[PDB]
Amino acid sequence: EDFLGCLVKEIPPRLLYAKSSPAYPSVLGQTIRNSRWSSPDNVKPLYIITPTQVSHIQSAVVCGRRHTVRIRVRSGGHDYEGLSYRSLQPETFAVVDLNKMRAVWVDGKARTAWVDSGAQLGELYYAIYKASPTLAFPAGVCPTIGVGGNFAGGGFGMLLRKYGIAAENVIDVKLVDANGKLHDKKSMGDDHFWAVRGGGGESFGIVVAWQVKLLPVPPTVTIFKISKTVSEGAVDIINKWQVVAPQLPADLMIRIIAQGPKATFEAMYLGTCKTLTPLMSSKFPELGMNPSHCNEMSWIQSIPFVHLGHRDALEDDLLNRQNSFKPFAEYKSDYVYQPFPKTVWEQILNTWLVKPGAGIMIFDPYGATISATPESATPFPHRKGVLFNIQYVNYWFAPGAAAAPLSWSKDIYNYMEPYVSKNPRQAYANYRDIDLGRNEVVNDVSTYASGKVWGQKYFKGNFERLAITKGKVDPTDYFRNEQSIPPLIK
Template identity: 65%
Template sequence: MAPPRSLALALLLCALSASCHASISYPPSAMPAAAPAKDDFLSCLTKSVSPRLLYTKSSPAYGSIWASTVRNLKFDSDKTVKPLYIITPTEAAHIQATVACGRKHGMRVRVRSGGHDYEGLSYRSAKPETFAVVDMSMMRHLSINGRNATAWVDSGAQLGDIYYFTGKYTPRLAFPAGVCSTIGVGGHFSGGGFGMMLRKHGIAVDNVIDAKVVDANGILLDRKSMGEDYFWAIRGGGGESFGIVVSWQLKLVPVPPKVTVFQVYRGLKDGAIDLITKWQQVAPSLPEDLMIRIMAMGDTAMFEALFLGTCKDLLPLMGSRFPELGVKQADCKEMSWVQSTAYIPMGASATVNDLLNRTSNIKAFGKYKSDYVKDPIPKAVWEKIYTWLAKPGAGIMIMDPYGAKISSIPDRATPFPHRQGMLFNIQYVSYWSGEAGSAAPTQWSRDMYAFMEPYVTKNPRQAYVNYRDLDLGVNQVVGDISTYESGRVWGEKYFKCNFERLARIKAKVDPTDYFRNEQSIPPLFK
């Protein structure tokens, strides 16, 4: 039972406790909420940045530049609040000048790398606001040091760039990050970044060893000059809160010359519910070389796996640990690791060269939510879940198992806290075509989320910051500073008790809250 690789499958593949609370006081003064001097900002910027890298709303290419990486069509609308300017830097000095001029003339900036932000906050505002966007798409240099098994990559690169050039350099090195190749490095790493090797090598930021960031004063810093608190915050604390990360140094990880992938479909009549019920206990306890995730949709479940080894070694493992799934030799596809990074999101016809494609033919509207599960969900509940998946306009559930490496790292090691004791993550994907105002898919998403509340994490109900969801709450601004109280509503869901530390670091490195959006870290002052 293997349905064709449809738009739905392509889209889904790409795609609070008292101890956390703190007392709050505010600084005696903050950046005044003055109306930006638009002409002065542009005049200041053109002294350091070529006009060919700047786009105003009157520029002929403004519309195409702005829309170039809009991945969610619900924001490609005349009603969307768009930036006054788009800056496309080609070097760190251009970013430094943008921040310096923005601070001097009251022009805030947002930052876009790949445009996959589910709420579009990297390139639009959810409320009327005057701002500029630093579009990192022209900064995508990558260099590999094979002797040290490290790489430097710019934030404007995409995951596909890392995978392609690492695989081209050697088939024995890789990097553990997300599934969709068009995801931008800057945003992905800023939220943590997990993918098919999370059980073997952890998440992307567990393997980041240095970075270069432009801070709120326009100063370019590295790990040594920024300090360990700042470095901790940018590795998973969410984008657009602490500065603009120009580039990241990565620790590459070893992989075997051949890996094995399988995609096995099981319908309800094939016992899908029994299989999922067992999977949620088996998958997190499997050897770290094996990752099996599930896409549940309609009356079907697709079990998708990456095994860091050959089919010869995989089949006995599946036979002893998960025989009910019935994986056979014919289900196995052996390939190099880099080939698997194209095959998994794009299908059997994809080639490694497709990893360099910076455009997407997916044209849909979307709404996304997420959950974490610590205790197995009973079979009777899975039966009810499938009634939700059968409803008109229903979306998809993507479930990624944890355990092994990702769960062996302490929750406070990085801002990403969803580690110890976690069985799996759920992403709810609702998508539709047609008008942006369609309410039915959005309602399904919210109703499904409400139904799942008894079966997922509590106090707080956790969520993954890279699956950004404004339903969880938005910042309120008082005196031109985002308030800690309003941020805590959504922030502890993404970061648990790490949110307080993030807010204290924010107060040190950006006390005037220059870098902000609707879900940026607010400053917490002593």
């Protein structure tokens, strides 16, 4: 009662929603991306606040502290476990939903931009394009991802070999901490500014906006998508790829998508067909690339082309808030440091991807710029020595049909254990997977020991620094979820 009373004193009431508010279901559902988490059995927020000004965010946090109601912040809603808008067990929380804070102000001459966390990536990319056809920013492939969550957890895409992760190209932030105080880089200090850029969402406060450096791209880039079935020699070709691709020049990223006994090699090249073709002949002739495979286009056009296969619908693909695609979805991830034996590739393609409930596997090669950053320089530790990341993606589209895909996801993770990173088995924070472990709360604070179990998987040797920083900026563990950094205090 008095939490709401506090909010109503400080925030326009049209931006406040209780469970009985007629628009509450629509507002709650607007950026839910996973049909597992939209159904009535999920734990719902007591209130939703949709700020349009930073002062609204500050007021909400101050009210939450005064009346001990915790807040889950949502930007784009893509959290794989829905932790921006649901809790796993019954508890009281509010959602602060930033979708109305979505400005992107680009300074093309300075090659910088300020981007509100509630902007979607496609809107950031498009605003960059409205300023210049030869600037880019290296974040995700999916246009509807929120800036807030993507950057907080790192953020990587088809420019990762050239420019690393989104978070290491952030030059300032505007942030509201657990006491409602407004911060920038200067006021935050080294530890807090280090942590917020890749240490995961929620834990380190609400980022209102991010200042980014914009990076050059040529006026023409080249994409190809070359498929090889196992009959066409996919196993020998991917067995070669895992060694070659992480060693290719920084201008060339060749990822793989597999969803059966067939691998599709998808390349983004910062250059022309004219120079790509000989580069392929020299470094990876086994793929059989020729100029007919080239698709030359602008960098901005590559975003819908890589993700959707579209060539012709730039604004519709990048400016999209309809939320039409809502699979039931499960996700896992791994990092690989040693080449798979050929027999493992055989099993993946011929056996694991031909099972009931089998998902899709996406393989992103590292090396070059992402791997040149030291493991501790940012919270994102998956750097030197990484050959590739794996994402295991399971989509399905009917309720009551989760058993088979959930079992496959578990079973293939077990099969892969001997071949991927270990001690710890590394995972990407933004591919959130609650089965890696969850927090225990004791005396209303997430425990360090419970956090460490999953925390070392996402953050390796950076976990303890993250937790000490958490202890300094949020000792009472106000901003938390079931898999957020616990405070480690004296």
